[PDB]
Subunit: 227 residues, 4 copies
């Protein structure tokens, strides 16, 4: 059953649970030398993220089977997630494809913006191609992280206007924060503790998007790169 | 060594890999999605060679920019794959040689640009509107998948200029030897390719084939099948 | 569809990718280790294309063996890279389509074999002795990096036969169009290449160049520099 | 300083510590469907292993700098480790190389065998090319795992005969078992709990070498594939 109750996560499998004290020393992995003073520890290594995304793609493929759906990348932060997910989905679909098979997905990009420093401004700006191209489509939203859940409640509310057939959510990280509004995704990678994470395309003020691993920015990093 | 700032002149550009008119590989030489075979004539550039060439391209870029902050601008949707592999190699190269005193090399931007229907330019370019004044006084590197007619870049560079950017240089994965070409050159260029419409590595025919790993030629049956 | 069992005849083998006499790329098209440039003339087959072709080769192998247990035999040292990429793609392909009732596809074996000094065969083959009776009554797939003179395989297949194996088939990454060739054919073959001594992708000149990612031609200066 | 006191690990950095209760559900990652009944959980995902090996290669490169050394792959189980380590070492060395630079390493293969089912037989068989080629060389031994430490004490004892200049050890896993003889490596990936692991080239009776992740074989798997 293709999901279609955004925020409920009706039949979602549990994420990898990342505990409050989980993670690794900066010296356990490769870290850009200059980034090292601004990071407290590695939370989730690049490699686990890729391994986990692979399974998500499989989970997704198993739900949609062969139904055409349309993947929306919520830019800029979900870019890493989205490229990884696409890679894996294509390989899984195309490895099992026969001569009579069909293409599986279309791809679309929406820039979504709300954060200043480490907090939501509680407002939301969006820029995309005209979303009327989604009318009557199965749509899969790909979001790097769910934090307050404001981005998605607000974004999914906007999507209701355009007569989309189904809306489902894939999320890489979900943060256990008391600021969360209850928005659950339908496919979820990791549940993480309440700290601001950078890397794997996630930023603090346009910095760290290039960091391979998901890490916790320390206070000095937050101060140095404050808006 | 200087940062390019003559968009379209490619003043000091290295030669791309030249792909001859007869170059290519049979579909059965490589992995090809089963349903796609009947719509392709051949593999023009394998995924792996594309990736190895993006790697060198990123090294060229780093040899020009050095440690100078620049802003990388992705022309969606077709440049995604190119842009992705480029970020990956640039970061590794920049971050491998980085020292504790170093700083990040680039910012990343996305503009969606559209002009094709089937295998031809409509001659009009749709630019999805975003305020680009964050780029005022910045070095910008445009990342484009392909130069064909050159219309996309001629028009987009006019647009960009109005934002009072410091410099504009162009990274292009493919450049097509078509008579339609208006003469727009890139400053870093992956391959020079024969005049055939290509799909794969994020390049589509009517939203189809983007997921195809290799750069291949769509055949006429596929062009008719997927006509808009 | 049947398991090959005529070592050297390549009875039903698919055609390899043909690399023409003039095929290749300039060293500056790809990443090349700085100290290696002066010893190479050109890139013959980029790393990425090698990898894409091993992928298809593994698919061919799986289309022949299906779910039948077989034993993969790595001819060290030069076949390591080839063997590695082959294991990777075979497992993914086998394990992606696997069901809960499935079983593993293959075992993996290693024999070290040696016969070259500089760029020529000594005409005598050193086989590092191991008891291979674990292979009695088994399908064995030999993985060899290159067929040149064909001496390695002719001799090694004689050796292997004494162990009373069920079948012997050959996977070869490269096969060289040299007049020295004794006619030994493989059953799965990656590329047919011109008659030049090649290095990279685990293939050496006197233990040098194995780490080089691309298959390139060593020049005469490098052959003289590293002469034994 | 190139290490040269095999078993002491004189100046070794601490490994990633993998706790007794650490790991992931089989359903968190891709697992060959048929292997799933024979595995209790994932211990260390493929991706963390690769990320960790990358840093080891860096650690190694930093010690040897530009001195020629010779890498010995202890077959069959250390194959995955060895190929990963080589990949990363070459890229790190060749990325920083200049025109006047030199090749960094030679490579050699030694088959070492001692286990039956999940235990050492307390004997050791070895097959390699003539190790006299190591005379006067810096040698780096690459071993997938240290368990009883019998393989390496015995192997390093054999190497003393051949006038090797230096012997250093790189190890991917070290198991916290009371059966351990005290042999420490000089470069170490992970400290792991006391269970028999499979995957990433590590087997139980030639099975599981192809499993991407490092996992704990369950009792049913041990029984099914008993010698
Ligand atoms: O821990 C973090 N790190 C980096 N970026 C973010 C963001 C910003 N980006 C998120 C959408 O891409 C906001 C999700 P919302 O509206 O539910 O808080 C939130 N949390 C973090
Ligand atoms: O051969 C092709 N294959 C697939 N897509 C395209 C496109 C569509 N996209 C190009 C910008 O990304 C148009 C470039 P222009 O304006 O210079 O002709 C052009 N040629 C090809
Ligand atoms: O062009 C080359 N480059 C590098 N190494 C080799 C070798 C060495 N190794 C080959 C077996 O792996 C010899 C194959 P044979 O006995 O059929 O000539 C042969 N040709 C080349
Ligand atoms: O947990 C495990 N899993 C798989 N294989 C092994 C082996 C077998 N292989 C090791 C050398 O490659 C033995 C190391 P030693 O002599 O110190 O016990 C030991 N432990 C394990
Ligand atoms: Mg952000
Ligand atoms: Mg297009
Ligand atoms: Mg050789
Ligand atoms: Mg074993």
């Amino acid at each position: 059953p293709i999901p279609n109750n955004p925020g409920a996560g009706e039949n979602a499998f549990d994420p990898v649970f990342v505990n409050d004290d989980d993670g690794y020393d900066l010296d356990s992995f490769m870290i850009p030398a200059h980034y090292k003073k601004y990071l407290t520890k590695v939370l989730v290594p690049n490699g686990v993220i890729k391994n986990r995304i692979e399974k998500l793609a499989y989970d997704i493929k198993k739900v949609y089977n062969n139904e055409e759906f349309h993947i929306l990348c919520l830019l800029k932060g979900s870019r890493g997630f989205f490229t990884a997910l696409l890679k894996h989905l294509s390989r899984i679909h195309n490895y099992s494809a026969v001569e009579t098979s069909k293409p599986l997905f279309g791809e679309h990009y929406v820039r979504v913006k709300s954060y200043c420093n480490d907090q939501s401004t509680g407002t939301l700006e969006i820029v995309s191609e005209d979303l009327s191209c989604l009318k009557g489509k199965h749509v899969l939203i790909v979001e790097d992280i769910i934090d307050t859940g404001k981005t998605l409640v607000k974004f999914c509310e906007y999507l209701k206007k355009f007569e989309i057939k189904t809306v489902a959510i894939a999320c890489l990280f979900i943060k256990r924060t008391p600021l969360w509004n209850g928005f659950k995704a339908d496919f979820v990678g990791f549940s993480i503790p309440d700290h601001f994470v950078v890397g794997y395309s996630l930023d603090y003020n346009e910095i760290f998007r290039d960091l391979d691993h998901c890490c916790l920015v320390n206070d000095e990093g937050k101060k140095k790169y404050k808006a």
